[PDB]
Design a protein around this ligand. Structure first.
Ligand SMILES: *Cc1c(COP(=O)(O)O)cnc(C)c1O
Ligand SMILES: *Cc1c(COP(=O)(O)O)cnc(C)c1O
Ligand SMILES: [Cl-]
Ligand SMILES: [Cl-]
Lengths: 405, 405
């Protein structure tokens, strides 16, 4: 069972002060703080084992190469992929979606075809598809929202047809905390021969994820939201698909042969998709982040976070004129607005109290437009956040309401 | 003036042992070791100031955003760019070339046009242009090599014509150590209305670089070869060009507005070219690497390295049957083969002595083919390497020759 006090002891940032006040970091959905175990694993790699990794012969380079492929295997086990070779190292969720949109999209989505997204998607899972649709002359269809922040699943018959090549869908909304019924939707998409990319950037830190059970064709997430370093993420692709995909970025390490007269040939996947020096330091840190999370246990994390979320929603009932957005069973984040006050001002006052929340459109402008607001506040309730921090948020909103009403 | 002993004290890896023997790291051209100042600057950011950066309102996020834009300014001063807004953060040299090849290349290189590269280019500065040429139906022309590892500049009249859209050229060869006469070549390229991308990945650590004096249109380099963290590099583009370039990767932070009915608009450059969460940790580390190098002084580094290189070349004369590749005035690297022995075996014996060199084709297969060898050994002589390490290399090659002859 989970002890939030022992977990918080691993996170040096949580002792920091802001504005002279103790920090309450409620913005993990934008990016997560990192434990000492992750920070030090990367630092120690730099301090004692650093070298280039492309299977160099000397010892440090050979050992660094092995460390990197071991992290690839560990990540594949973390999401229950069948093979380490189904995982590609990318900069983050965003780059992984762009890689799919170009390598797979350009070869599989043709003029007159359509791609389906939802109205709750992050811009990372919208813009690459808008670009692809403009490149090839395809149509971008949209699953709309219900008022409670769930998908209008009844619209799926009008959106899926025989020209639907891809569903790109969020696992968990970064704003609403809605968890979408992926297994269901993937079954339906596969009935039409459509592939499914899942944006898992807000899923992998909250509960176990199993891509064989999901049967998704692509799955993406970012290391820095998973208590890991910036600059690294994971793209999972089914082996049979990944083996047919052409390269995206070109350069060293993704080639088999390079000739200026007879052209160039590519190596095998996933290495075909990793051009140039990888982010070895980020990969080491990501491996340590996975070990740290697995040691705590994702079901223990999920239990503690669900109880924290239930407590926050119960306490926020005592805030006057508070508008919440999204379903009651939300994961990870609480999106809200306070009376008629602009989110920017609410977030400013909260920051003035030492409380870090995110304000704005949260890279989800279509979602904001659906709710007819320009912005929202959002509080993340992660595994190192406490009841007392929730109390500080509730009290802060009460004070703000009273001061500005 | 330069003190190699004080510099080496900053680098914790240099005390490491390999095979039970003290490490001689002569592979900095593949990737450089990092000083404590760089390692700790990144670690301390994670420990005390970490947050997401897209101009979030709360304090940590606002301060992190400022740290990132300050590094952008520091990098622009480091290469004497006119404006911080001419620099784009990329994963490394390779990604930066791919970004140019797609964003600029797709809009400016048409069927029947030509692009000029050289026979000494790294694969990073070949493959993206091969891909572009195949995409748009253009021709990839090649400046050939002289036996001494310099460009056959006499061939330039037959290669430049009015259809030449781009010269992509290495500043310093990662194999030969040749420094190309960029200012000259850029003048000639501009006479034809061609743009010039410079691959500076092996230049920026050896002497000052000044892109206004060079007048190059694009310039790329990687942080990890500049004593900095992996996963981060710099693409410089002339403002007037960069402002016309369309985005490459799509997603959060590079947009102005996103609509599912009225389409999407882009923000201003360079931010238009940075999609999703940046590698904030790598950027912090890169800033510290720039400060560290500037504190030592690039002219002091260049002086010490030039004298070390002169010493090594003088000492290597006492190795029987040693073949050197490249010009006498080489920078940074010594490429060699020992008698008829395969580079792989020579490098294995050297690693067995604790000496890390690189063997293989060094991501320069066309260069290897020019010299009619499959592979070379390469020893890097960087600012923290010593005369004694050169002595160990010379003695090792002598022992290898005697044992295997
Ligand atoms: C290493 C190198 C590259 C590639 O840099 P990455 O950091 O691997 O992207 C490109 N060009 C030259 C000359 C190099 O030495
Ligand atoms: C943050 C996020 C992304 C983007 O991740 P990056 O790490 O910035 O690339 C994509 N999707 C969702 C749902 C997110 O929360
Ligand atoms: Cl290669
Ligand atoms: Cl955005």
């Amino acid at each position: 069972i989970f002890s939030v006090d022992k977990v918080r002891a691993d996170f040096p940032v949580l002792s920091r002060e802001v504005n002279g006040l103790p920090l309450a970091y409620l913005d993990s959905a934008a990016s997560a703080q990192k434990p000492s175990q992750v920070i030090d694993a990367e630092a120690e790699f730099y301090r004692h084992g650093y070298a280039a990794v492309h299977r160099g012969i000397h010892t440090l380079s050979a050992q660094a190469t092995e460390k990197m492929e071991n992290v690839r295997k560990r990540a594949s086990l973390f999401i229950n992929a069948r093979s380490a070779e189904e995982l590609v190292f990318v900069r983050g969720t965003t780059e992984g979606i762009n890689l799919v949109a170009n390598s797979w999209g350009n070869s599989n989505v043709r003029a007159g075809d359509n791609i389906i997204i939802s109205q709750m998607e992050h811009h990372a899972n919208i813009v690459p598809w808008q670009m692809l649709c403009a490149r090839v002359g395809a149509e971008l269809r949209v699953i709309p929202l219900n008022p409670d922040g769930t998908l209008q699943l009844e619209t799926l018959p009008t959106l899926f047809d025989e020209k639907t090549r891809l569903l790109a869908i969020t696992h968990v909304s970064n704003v609403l905390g809605t968890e979408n019924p992926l297994a269901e939707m993937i079954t339906l998409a596969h009935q039409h021969g459509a592939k499914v990319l899942v944006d898992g950037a807000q899923a992998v830190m909250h509960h176990p994820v199993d891509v064989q059970a999901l049967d998704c064709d692509f799955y993406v997430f970012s290391g820095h939201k998973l208590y890991g370093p910036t600059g690294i993420g994971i793209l999972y692709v089914k082996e049979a698909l990944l083996q047919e995909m052409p390269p995206w970025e070109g350069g060293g390490s993704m080639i088999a042969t390079v000739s200026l007269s007879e052209g160039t040939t590519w190596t095998k996947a996933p290495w075909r998709f990793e051009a140039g020096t990888p982010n070895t330091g980020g990969i080491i840190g990501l491996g340590a982040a996975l070990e740290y999370v697995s040691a705590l246990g994702l079901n223990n994390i999920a239990e503690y976070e669900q109880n924290l979320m239930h407590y926050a929603l119960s306490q926020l009932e005592s805030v006057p004129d508070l508008t919440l957005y999204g379903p009651q069973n939300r994961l990870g984040v609480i999106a809200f607005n306070l009376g008629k006050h602009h989110a920017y001002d609410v977030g400013s006052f909260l920051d003035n109290y030492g409380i870090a929340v995110r304000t704005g459109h949260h890279c989800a402008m279509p979602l904001m437009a659906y709710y007819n607001v320009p912005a929202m506040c959002r509080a993340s309730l992660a595994m190192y956040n406490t009841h007392e921090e929730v109390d500080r948020l509730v009290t802060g909103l009460q004070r703000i309401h009273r001061l500005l009403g």
